[PDB]
Amino acid sequence: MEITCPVCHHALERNGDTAHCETCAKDFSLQALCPDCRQPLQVLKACGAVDYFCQNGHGLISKKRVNFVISDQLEHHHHHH
Ligand SMILES: [Zn+2]
Ligand SMILES: [Zn+2]
């Protein structure tokens, strides 16, 4: 599977939260979603760092099975529900 740019299939490096695209100079921020509850789950922040983990608001997941999706698109005013 790996992680590569949809444009330049080389190799994207993950620093946590965001994966950096080499050529393109693009940063892909990945958000931790559930397959059943498709939300930011619950915003856990520590020293600024953030992880999306629905503790009591839904139920915890092993981070090995959490859906880290690259959502850098405008979800505010157009992506309506
Ligand atoms: Zn690239
Ligand atoms: Zn959950």
Question: How many Å apart are CA 75 and CA 65, to the nearest integer?
Answer: 24
Residue 75's Cβ-count burial label (10 Å; 0-12, 13-18, 19+) is exposed
Reference 69, options 26, 36, 40; nearest CA is: 40
Question: How many Å apart are CA 51 and CA 17, to the nearest integer?
Answer: 7
Distance in Å, CA 60 to ligand 1 centroid: 34
SS3 sequence of the chain: CCCCCCCCCCCCEECCCEEECCCCCCEEEEEEECCCCCCCCCEEEECCEEEECCCCCCCCCCCCCCEEEECCCCCCCCCCC
Domains, in order of start, for the chain: 12-72 (2.10.290.10)
Task: Please name which ligand lies nearest the alpha carbon of 61.
Answer: 2
Question: How many Å apart are CA 32 and CA 1, to the nearest integer?
Answer: 18
Task: Please name which ligand lies nearest the alpha carbon of 9.
Answer: 1
